[PDB]
Each structure stands twice: as structure tokens, then as C-alpha cells.
Design an enzyme around this catalytic site. Structure first.
Site, PDB file in Angstrom:
ATOM      1  N   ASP A 137       0.837  -1.003   0.058  1.00 29.81           N
ATOM      2  CA  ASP A 137      -0.011  -0.154  -0.120  1.00 29.81           C
ATOM      3  C   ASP A 137       0.695   1.134   0.012  1.00 29.81           C
ATOM      4  O   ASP A 137       0.240   2.544  -0.004  1.00 29.81           O
ATOM      5  CB  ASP A 137      -1.016  -0.019   1.067  1.00 29.81           C
ATOM      6  CG  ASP A 137      -2.054  -1.141   0.959  1.00 29.81           C
ATOM      7  OD1 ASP A 137      -2.434  -1.370  -0.161  1.00 29.81           O
ATOM      8  OD2 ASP A 137      -2.355  -1.656   2.086  1.00 29.81           O
TER       9      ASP A 137
ATOM     10  N   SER B  13       2.897   7.240   0.441  1.00 26.97           N
ATOM     11  CA  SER B  13       2.020   6.375   1.124  1.00 26.97           C
ATOM     12  C   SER B  13       0.751   6.617   0.682  1.00 26.97           C
ATOM     13  O   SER B  13      -0.045   7.587   1.233  1.00 26.97           O
ATOM     14  CB  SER B  13       2.273   6.829   2.652  1.00 26.97           C
ATOM     15  OG  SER B  13       1.230   5.801   3.700  1.00 26.97           O
ATOM     16  N   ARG B  14       0.250   5.985  -0.056  1.00 18.03           N
ATOM     17  CA  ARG B  14      -0.997   6.215  -0.742  1.00 18.03           C
ATOM     18  C   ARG B  14      -2.464   6.272   0.110  1.00 18.03           C
ATOM     19  O   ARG B  14      -3.647   6.283  -0.411  1.00 18.03           O
ATOM     20  CB  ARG B  14      -1.366   5.372  -1.997  1.00 18.03           C
ATOM     21  CG  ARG B  14      -1.708   3.921  -1.729  1.00 18.03           C
ATOM     22  CD  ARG B  14      -2.012   3.183  -3.107  1.00 18.03           C
ATOM     23  NE  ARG B  14      -0.789   3.308  -4.016  1.00 18.03           N
ATOM     24  CZ  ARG B  14       0.463   2.914  -3.988  1.00 18.03           C
ATOM     25  NH1 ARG B  14       0.577   1.965  -2.943  1.00 18.03           N
ATOM     26  NH2 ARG B  14       1.314   2.930  -4.767  1.00 18.03           N
ATOM     27  N   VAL B  15      -2.173   6.114   1.597  1.00 19.22           N
ATOM     28  CA  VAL B  15      -3.171   6.346   2.404  1.00 19.22           C
ATOM     29  C   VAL B  15      -3.701   7.341   2.827  1.00 19.22           C
ATOM     30  O   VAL B  15      -4.634   7.533   3.530  1.00 19.22           O
ATOM     31  CB  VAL B  15      -3.092   5.037   3.455  1.00 19.22           C
ATOM     32  CG1 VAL B  15      -2.835   3.803   2.796  1.00 19.22           C
ATOM     33  CG2 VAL B  15      -1.900   5.344   4.205  1.00 19.22           C
ATOM     34  N   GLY B  16      -2.961   8.238   2.498  1.00 19.91           N
ATOM     35  CA  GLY B  16      -3.200   9.824   2.829  1.00 19.91           C
ATOM     36  C   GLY B  16      -3.021  10.017   4.372  1.00 19.91           C
ATOM     37  O   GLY B  16      -2.623   9.173   5.324  1.00 19.91           O
TER      38      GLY B  16
END
Ligand SMILES: Nc1ncnc2c1ncn2[C@@H]1O[C@H](COP(=O)(O)OP(=O)(O)OP(=O)(O)O)[C@@H](O)[C@H]1O
Ligand SMILES: [Mg+2]
Lengths: 52, 116, 288, 69, 367, 52, 73, 116
Positions: free
Chosen positions: E204, E229-232
Site C-alpha cells: 500500500d 504512502s497512498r493511504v493519505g
């Protein structure tokens, strides 16, 4: 004019005094972990007492 | 992308837009380094017009309505085409870039511009 | 193959590209500074030409050796160049113009004299030789007239001996913010050119000459010539800045092109290596 | 001097009280001198170096372009 | 939490997320994992370390260090050292995943860490090869993608409804979770190698380590320029979620235009000021192992950053400045940071207290 | 004005002395508190060592 | 010959007194010249002493030429 | 190389010597181009210290039987720490680097410098 310039010297002296304070802070703060390490070894001494 | 597909005028219009956007892109570096007011005023016009273009191509979305309010706008061709053509004609060089931002058709753009 | 080294070469070229970009920006700032510097020298020459014209219109009874023109036997030449190159080919085409002009003059059987400014031209004419008597470097972006003073006086005295008859300033005219051209113009021989123009009356009012008008005018001509030299130096420095800026831009562009080239070849080579190794593996496995 | 405008064409002048201020003109003199040092200290160091390593070892690559092995 | 301002700011990490540390060799990756582990004094989660093909000396050193931290009490670790049967090594990460899933299915949240998934992949390659199976590219049987992927996805944060139904009523409130922190070692920083390429599309989010920075003494040597970190911000606390953007944009601007280090002796002043800002904030993240920063510490550092109250001090003593500030608040205003890390909320009263303390510190004892 | 200046000189030196006292007592107190906490934590370490 | 990479672990031990005595400065000059290769095309702005080193390297380089079938005592 | 295992002072001395040597290396090119003079007075002492460091590293071998007489040095780590600390400080950044060549501790360096 000279007296006014002269007061400023006192502030510098005060700053130097404050600076010493950090010296003493560091120096005696060192002593804390000095004791920590030394009687940590003393704990190791209880340990090899236990090993005997 | 062929005049035999979208038609003649549509094709030429799109090609012209592409030319403008290119032209401005190579303008960018000079604008950055050697200032702005050291160029042809026609080039400055190109700059403003391209900025309007970029401001305009974005739009509200009907899906964006639930996201952040601002209900989206459905727009077909033959208005986009006309509005862009008029922009290329420079007949809208009297308006700030803001009227083109987050908006539907050119009629909406002029409505905002008058209201702005 | 040693692909990692290829990638490292790519990275180095990228870094060089950014450095060239910085070169260009610094050159731009220097350009603007020098471009400002040019304008400040106007009022000096303006007022001074005004008063010299007032003098000569008040006193046409005689002339000056710098106001006179006798047949030319020898000439002195003053060329201004950078201390470091890389700024276009300004020195190159400058040298071309000067050499063709000197050849044009020697077939008129007139000798050529020189005082040198700028290390590049210093070398360029030392190797050729010539009748050089002055040489200066370390000019900097804002030199002192002091620095020019020795050379300019050298030309002054040489002209006084009558050996040198015409003296040409050799510099590069700042044509515009991007293009500039070399310029070689005689200066010590002066003729009325806005010195007999831009005037419509001789003022019934005039100044009284606390020193002798002759020596006063002589000192004037001294200052005027020195100021002319100074502003020419300024202009050619600005031209150097422009040429360096353009050359840095071109360098950045060539760097980008080479980057594309290397990237393409790298892709090809990676493909080939993968093919070779997989063929090796499958053959070895097929062996059993 | 004119009845309405006066000026001095200065051979060299400084806003100053006395030649003792010579200690001040040299300040800008050496400042611009330091800048003159700096222009070289960057120019050759940046340009000549990096551009020198650029074309340096490229040949061994251009010769191995079509390598099948 | 990782105790790493750069990490916790630009690369948020949420409970149940798969995030990849990656880099070249001897880059402290092991140190990164273990320090992240240390920060779990208060998280209440448990942790598992999986070591693969390691020198028992190194293993024991890690053990001893952890014992010194005492954190080997909510912690369990298994190691497939280099002197072990290849199959043992191959299966070990799955076992670690099993232990993690235990608590996850108990509704608990935990963290696990792998070591050298590449190495266990090598072992699996050897095993498969000895089975006379058809080899793939670089001798790798294709299922390596399947092999890793069927492992990583087993860790996540689960819906509490799943928790409840599995417990059959035993527990109803919480939701289970398990966060995955694997590590991959790379050859000369390549990303095109088959195994890493497979790995990338799985996580992720990924974090790179650049050799030069640590060689330049940048400790830690993370390159934020590509690490994402594409989870914001959903994996940050509200206050950090608020205060990250300044660092984000300053570091951006710096990294586009850092080339001017020796330059800007003639350039415009705004560029110089922004460059100083960038240099200072870049230095700010230099950090030592075994010295985790509480989120309050990170908070005061970021506040001092964005407030520019370090935009007037020399770069060489920024770290000293920070440490002094740290101690100063820690002593003077302990209840404030107490409350902060109790909650981690941004409030005008809070920031006012913080700024008052900062300006006091500047007024008070120097650095 | 000179008399006023002298009065001001005293008015600054006294405050300098005061702030001096403030800073030095603060440093002393902080350091003592630190050594306190230090050896307490190291004592926890020693007892856990014996337990090991 | 490319002296930049060709070496012998044996060293002067297999050389007579005189040749070992002489070869030192030769090797040093070769190393210097090899050092300044990247700037060899810019002998206009470098140091004068560096130019002297380059000239010495050039001369010794040419000194290393020889014909075929023509060995030397 | 870790302070916890080697102590702090030795570690930080190693840090400083790394820094000075690597910075001296990267100036080699520009020094060749122009010369020491055009560099700021800063790093001139750095160049001298780096050269003296390189000389200090020259260690006569205990056992070759014939390289310089086979003299052993086996200097204590603490004495070398002392010497390099002084050199980094500049305690002896006033002596030709040759005095630091083919020797060990500060005693040998000073004795050599005085004998010459
Ligand atoms: N911030 C820091 N400050 C001081 N020392 C550090 C820091 N970070 C890491 N180190 C040191 O760097 C050393 C090497 O790091 P480490 O061994 O973790 O690299 P690695 O990639 O795990 O090695 P390998 O590739 O062999 O597994 C460690 O012993 C550690 O003490
Ligand atoms: Mg490791």
C-alpha cells in the site's frame, strides 16, 4: 551617551552567566548516568554473586 | 483525431488549441527566467488566452456534488466548440481567468464574469 | 553489461543539466545588473559634450590635436574581452572582424598598434604578435577607471607623438537583450558628429576660464575619452553575460537530447541481457 | 555652474569628510574584487568540470549499442 | 507511530496497512524496523519480528538490545538463521503471519516485520529447482508472485463485524488489525529486478533508502522524493494531519531547487530565504537510533519549523536547538504534552500555549 | 538627564542580578530533578537485571 | 600498451638495480598525465605547472614509441 | 564504527577525519584548475591537515625484514586518538607534512620535525 552604552555590557555579562548554567547543567546531569552505569555494574555484581 | 472524423472545423479548432498550449509551454521557461514584459505583446496575449484555456478545461462533476457540494454540469459539443472558438478569436480578452474555473458552458462563464 | 555505470552517467548528466540551469539564472541576474549599470554613465557624457560644444562654439579660433585629423601612418587599437571564455563566440567573431580590418589596413601600408584587455584576447594576439604596448586583465564586473587609466594614457601619449593617427575602440555593441554585435570605431580622431549638430545658437553668455582654456579643454578631452572607454567596457561585459546565458541554455538542451539517447539504448541493452540470460537458463535446464 | 543648475564632473569623489575615509572606498573595492574572484571560482569549477566529465567516457557506450552478446 | 518525523509526516502508516521499506544494503533497514518496534511502549499492540538467513551473532545482538529496552514482554520473535534448512526458512514468514492472525482474529491490533523476503524467495527458488520443476526467468518459478501475495494480504485491518461473528459473541466492540512491514534489499538500488517488481504492486506504499545520504551522514537516509504512502493523512493524528503540509511544500521547493547551494550570491532574496528554510528543515530530520520522538516532540518541532522561529538560527546547531527545546518543554510543560499525546488534537489554546513556551525558551536559556 | 541616567543604570543592574538569580536557580532545580529521575529509572533496570 | 590497468604483482624484484632506480619518476609522470586527461583539451586556463606536467607526459608518451623487430639493449 | 562500542570521542574523531578527507578530495579538480590562492583562506588549513593525515598514516612495518628495517609501531589506540585529535584541532598545523611521514605518534613527529 556613554553610560547608556555601558548598561548593555551588563546584559552581556548576564548572558555569560546564563551560559555557565548550561555548563553546570550538562556536567552534573552527566553524573546521573555515571552513577547509573557504575551501579548498573553493581547489579551485574549481584548477578555473578547469583552465579556463584 | 482527423477532419474526416470530428469534421473539418472541429479538427482545425483542436489543432489550434494544441498549437496554443504548446506555444505557451515553451513560453513558460522564458517567463520564468527573463521576466515577462520582455516579449511580444501578442505572445503575452497567447499567455493569457492559454491560461484561460487551462482554467476552463476543468469542470464540476455530478459525482462531485455529493463530495463537496457544487453540483456538476453536463455539457455536450457545439457549445464547447463555439465557446472555445470564440476564445480563440480573442473576443473574451476583457475578463479575468476566474470566470472559467469550476464552471460549465461559455454561457455560464459569461454569467459568472458579468456577476464577477 | 555494466548497466549501473550507464545509469550513473545519466544521473551525472542530469546534475550537469541542473547546474547549467543555475548558470543561466546567475547570468540573467548579472545581465540585469550590468544593464542597469549602463544607464548611469549617461549624464556625465551628456553634460560634458554639452559644455565642450559650448566651448568650441565659443572658441572656434583654434582646434585640438584630438580635434584635428592628419593623414594616417599608424593606428592604435583597443580590444576588450573576458577573463574566461564559454560565453558564446563573442571573442571569436570579434577577432574575425579585427583581423580582416587589420589586413584591410596593412594593404594601405599603415601599421597597427594595440593595448590589450581581457586574457582571452591577450593570448589571441600575443600568439599572433602585433605591435602591442598595453595589456590588462582582472577587470572584473565593476572595474575602476584607475585600472583603465594606465592603458588609456599609453594611447594618449602615443597619439601625441604622432606615431598613431587613428585609434579605434574594439568592443561588442549590445544590440538587444539577446543579440549583440562587435563594433570597431575610431575614437581619438574626432569630427563634428553631434559636436557640430544638436546646436542652434551660440550662447551670448559664456563661462570665464579660470585656467587657460587650452589646458582646460585638453583635460576635458582626457576625461571624455576615458569615460567613453569605461562605458564600452560596461557594454561588452553585458554582452559577455548574454552570450554565456545563451550558451548555457543550449548546453541544457543538448544534455536533454543525450539523456533521451542513452535511455533508449539502455532499454535495448536491458532487453538483450534478459534474453541472453533466460536462454542460458532454459538451455541449462533442458540439459537434464 | 549655471544660475540655476550646478554640477561637478568628478574624476573620483566619495560622500565623505576627509581622505581618512579612504578606509571606506577600499571596502567596496575589495567587495567587488571578491565578487570577481567568485565569478571564476564558480564559472570554471561548475562549467569546465561537469562538462569535462560529460563527454568523457561516452564512447564505450556508443560503440556497444547493438550488442547481442 | 514510528518516532520518525519524516516518516510520520510524509509517510503516514495506519493500523492494518502494508508498507514497504526498501533500499540497498547496510542501510539501517534492520534498525528502521527495530526502532519502529520500540515505539510501542504505549500503543498497546503486540509485535512479531521475523528474521531470515541471519548471523546468530546479529540475531543475539538484536535480542540483547531489545531486552535492554525490556520491550520483549509484549513481543515475540522467530528467526530462520542462515544455518537452517531452506524449507524452515521458506515457511517461517507464514508461521509469523499465523501468530499475528491469532490476535487479529481476537479483535486485537498488532505489528509484524519480515526480514529479507528476497532471501526466503531464494530459498524457495532452490527448493523448487531441486524438485525438477520448470524454471522461470532468473530460475524463478512463476508462483513467487503468488507466493508473496498470498502472504501479504493475510495482514490487514478487519471489519469488527467479522470479529464479532468469529468470537460468536465473545467480543463485540473492537476491530482486529495487523500492519505489515516487510523489507527488501536491492542490488545497486535497482527497482526493475523481477522480485522487487513483483513486490511493488502489492504494498500500500513504499519507502526507499538512498546510500549516498547515509554516506553523507544523513541519518536516517530516507529519500522522501519517491517514498510515498497512498493511504493519505487518514494514518496521522489530527494535529499532524494539520501540520504536515508545511514540511511537504518546503521540502518540495528545496528538492527542485537545491542545486543553488553554492549559488545565490546574486540571486533574488526570496530564493535565498526559501533556500535557508529548506536547508534547515532538511537537516531537521537527522536522527539517531533508539531515540524515538513522541508525537508531542514532533509537534513542537514542526510548530517551531512553520513558525520560522528557527529561520533565524544557524544551521550547524539546529539539532542542538531542537534538543534544548525538547528538554525545556519536557520539564516546564509536561502536562501539556501529556494531554497532547493523550489526544493529539490541534486547538488554538494548545498552539497558543506552545508558542508561548517557544518564545519563553528563546527568551530564556540559550542553545 | 545625567542624574536620570545614573538612576536608570541602577534600575538595570538590579534587574540583571534578579534575572541572574532566576536562571541559576532554575538550572540547579532542573538538574537535581533530572538526577533524581535518572537514578530511579536505573534502579528499575537493576532490579529487572536481578530478576533475569 | 595501456599502463593504466596493466601491472605485475612481481614488481621491481625482477628488475636490475639501474632500471628499477629509474622507472619511478616515469611512472609518476604517466600517472599525472592520466590524471589530467579530461582537461587535456583545454590547455588555455589551467595552471602553468600543470601545463608543464602535461608537456612532460606528452614527451614521455612519444618516448614510448618503437618500431617492430627492433628491440633495445 | 559505533559510539556505544568504541566510545564517543573516537567515533567523532573518525567522523571528522572522514569529512575533512572527503572534502579535500572533491576540491582536487578546482585546485588543479586555478590553484590554492583563488580558494578562500578557508580549507587551506584543511588541505594541509589532510596531507598531514596521509603522512601520519604511513606506518613502518614490523615484519617485512627488509622494507625500512622492520620496525614495529603497534601504537596504542589512545595515543593515536590523542594525535589525531590534536591534528584536527590544529595543534600542529604549522609543520611540513613530511614530519608526519613514515612515523607513528606525536612524539615521533615532533622529534622528526626538530631534528630536521
Ligand atoms: N540514526 C543513526 N545514528 C547512528 N547510527 C546509526 C543510525 N542508523 C543506523 N545506525 C547504525 O548503522 C549500522 C548499520 O545498519 P544496519 O546493520 O541496520 O544495516 P542493514 O541494512 O540492516 O545491514 P544488512 O544489509 O547487513 O542487514 C547499525 O549498526 C547502526 O548502529
Ligand atoms: Mg538486516
Amino acid at each position: 551617551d556613554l553610560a547608556d552604552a555601558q548598561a548593555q555590557v551588563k546584559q552581556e555579562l548576564d548572558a555569560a552567566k546564563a551560559q555557565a548554567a548550561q555548563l553546570i547543567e550538562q556536567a552534573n546531569r552527566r553524573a546521573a548516568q555515571l552513577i547509573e552505569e557504575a551501579r548498573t555494574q553493581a547489579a551485574a555484581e549481584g548477578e555473578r554473586i547469583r552465579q556463584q | 483525431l482527423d477532419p474526416l472524423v470530428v469534421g473539418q472545423e472541429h479538427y482545425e479548432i483542436a489543432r489550434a488549441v494544441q498549437n496554443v498550449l504548446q506555444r505557451y509551454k515553451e513560453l513558460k521557461d522564458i517567463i520564468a527566467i527573463l521576466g515577462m514584459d520582455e516579449l511580444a505583446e501578442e505572445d503575452k496575449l497567447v499567455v493569457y488566452r492559454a491560461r484561460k484555456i487551462q482554467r476552463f478545461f476543468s469542470q464540476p462533476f455530478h459525482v462531485a456534488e455529493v463530495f463537496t457540494g457544487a453540483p456538476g454540469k453536463l455539457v455536450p459539443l457545439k457549445e464547447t466548440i463555439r465557446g472555445f472558438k470564440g476564445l480563440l478569436a480573442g473576443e473574451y480578452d476583457h475578463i479575468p481567468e476566474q470566470a472559467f474555473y469550476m464552471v460549465g458552458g461559455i454561457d455560464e462563464v459569461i454569467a459568472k464574469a458579468e456577476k464577477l | 553489461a555494466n548497466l549501473k555505470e550507464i545509469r550513473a552517467k545519466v544521473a551525472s548528466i542530469k546534475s550537469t543539466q541542473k547546474i547549467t540551469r543555475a548558470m543561466q539564472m546567475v547570468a540573467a541576474s548579472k545581465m540585469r545588473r550590468a544593464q542597469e549599470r549602463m544607464a548611469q554613465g549617461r549624464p556625465y557624457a551628456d553634460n560634458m559634450r554639452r559644455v565642450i560644444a559650448h566651448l568650441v562654439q565659443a572658441n572656434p579660433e583654434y582646434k585640438h590635436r584630438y580635434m584635428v585629423d592628419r593623414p594616417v601612418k599608424r593606428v592604435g587599437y583597443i580590444i576588450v574581452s573576458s577573463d574566461r571564455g564559454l560565453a558564446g563566440g563573442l571573442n571569436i567573431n570579434l577577432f574575425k572582424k579585427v583581423v580582416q580590418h587589420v589586413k584591410a589596413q596593412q594593404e594601405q601600408s599603415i601599421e597597427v598598434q594595440f593595448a590589450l584587455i581581457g586574457q582571452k584576447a591577450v593570448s589571441f594576439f600575443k600568439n599572433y604578435g602585433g605591435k602591442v604596448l598595453g595589456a590588462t586583465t582582472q577587470i572584473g564586473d565593476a572595474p575602476s577607471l584607475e585600472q583603465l587609466t594606465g592603458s588609456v594614457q599609453v594611447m594618449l601619449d602615443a597619439f601625441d607623438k604622432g606615431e598613431l593617427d587613428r585609434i579605434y575602440l574594439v568592443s561588442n555593441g549590445f544590440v538587444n537583450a539577446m543579440t549583440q554585435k562587435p563594433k570597431v570605431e575610431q575614437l581619438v580622431p574626432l569630427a563634428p558628429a553631434e559636436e557640430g549638430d544638436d546646436l542652434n545658437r551660440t550662447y551670448g553668455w559664456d563661462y570665464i576660464y579660470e585656467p587657460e582654456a587650452e589646458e582646460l579643454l585638453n583635460g576635458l578631452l582626457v576625461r571624455y575619452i576615458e569615460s567613453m572607454v569605461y562605458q564600452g567596457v560596461i557594454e561588452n561585459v553585458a554582452c559577455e553575460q548574454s552570450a554565456r546565458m545563451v550558451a548555457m541554455k543550449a548546453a541544457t538542451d543538448n544534455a536533454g537530447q543525450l539523456i533521451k539517447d542513452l535511455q533508449l539504448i539502455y532499454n535495448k541493452l536491458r532487453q538483450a541481457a534478459i534474453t541472453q540470460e533466460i536462454s542460458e537458463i532454459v538451455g541449462g535446464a533442458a540439459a537434464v | 555652474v549655471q544660475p540655476h543648475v550646478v554640477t561637478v564632473l568628478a574624476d573620483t569623489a566619495i560622500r565623505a569628510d576627509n581622505l581618512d575615509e579612504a578606509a571606506i572606498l577600499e571596502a567596496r573595492k575589495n567587495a567587488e574584487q571578491l565578487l570577481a574572484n567568485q565569478k571564476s571560482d564558480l564559472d570554471s569549477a561548475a562549467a569546465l568540470a561537469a562538462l569535462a566529465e560529460t563527454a568523457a567516457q561516452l564512447e564505450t557506450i556508443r560503440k556497444i549499442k547493438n550488442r547481442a552478446q | 507511530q514510528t518516532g520518525y518525523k519524516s516518516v510520520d509526516t510524509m509517510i503516514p502508516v495506519g493500523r492494518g496497512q502494508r508498507e514497504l521499506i526498501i533500499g540497498d544494503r547496510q542501510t539501517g533497514k534492520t534498525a528502521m524496523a527495530i526502532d519502529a518496534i520500540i515505539a510501542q511502549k504505549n500503543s498497546g499492540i503486540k509485535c512479531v519480528y521475523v528474521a531470515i538467513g541471519q548471523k546468530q551473532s546479529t540475531i543475539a545482538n538484536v535480542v540483547r538490545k531489545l531486552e535492554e529496552t525490556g520491550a520483549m514482554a509484549y513481543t515475540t520473535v522467530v528467526a530462520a538463521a542462515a544455518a537452517d534448512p531452506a524449507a524452515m526458512q521458506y515457511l517461517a514468514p507464514y508461521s509469523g503471519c499465523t501468530m499475528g492472525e491469532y490476535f487479529r482474529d481476537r479483535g486485537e491490533d498488532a505489528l509484524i516485520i519480515y526480514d529479507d523476503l528476497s532471501k526466503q524467495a531464494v530459498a524457495y527458488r532452490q527448493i523448487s529447482l531441486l524438485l525438477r520443476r520448470p524454471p522461470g526467468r532468473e530460475a524463478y518459478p512463476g508462483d513467487v508472485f503468488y507466493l508473496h501475495s498470498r502472504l501479504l494480504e493475510r495482514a490487514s485491518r478487519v471489519s469488527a463485524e467479522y470479529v464479532e461473528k468469529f468470537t460468536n459473541g465473545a467480543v463485540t466492540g473492537k476491530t482486529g488489525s495487523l500492519t505489515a512491514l516487510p523489507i527488501i534489499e536491492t542490488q545497486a538500488g535497482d527497482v526493475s529486478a523481477f522480485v522487487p517488481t513483483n513486490v511493488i504492486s502489492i504494498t500500500d506504499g513504499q519507502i526507499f533508502l538512498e546510500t549516498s545520504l547515509f554516506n553523507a551522514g544523513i541519518r536516517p537516509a530516507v529519500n522522501a522524493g519517491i517514498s510515498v504512502s497512498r493511504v493519505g493523512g487518514s494514518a496521522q493524528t489530527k494535529i499532524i494531519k494539520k501540520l504536515s503540509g508545511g514540511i511537504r511544500t518546503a521540502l518540495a521547493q528545496y528538492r527542485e531547487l537545491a542545486a543553488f547551494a553554492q549559488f545565490a550570491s546574486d540571486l533574488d532574496e526570496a530564493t535565498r530565504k526559501q533556500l535557508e528554510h529548506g536547508q534547515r528543515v532538511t537537516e531537521l530530520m537527522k536522527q539517531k537510533q533508539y531515540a524515538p520522538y513522541s508525537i508531542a516532540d514532533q509537534a513542537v518541532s514542526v510548530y517551531a519549523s512553520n513558525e520560522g522561529y528557527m529561520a533565524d538560527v544557524e544551521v550547524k546547531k539546529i539539532v542542538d536547538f531542537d534538543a534544548a527545546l525538547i528538554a525545556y518543554f519536557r520539564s516546564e510543560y509536561a502536562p501539556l504534552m501529556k494531554q497532547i499525546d493523550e489526544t493529539g488534537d490541534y486547538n488554538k489554546d494548545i498552539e497558543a500555549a506552545i508558542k508561548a513556551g517557544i518564545e519563553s525558551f528563546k527568551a530564556t536559556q540559550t542553545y
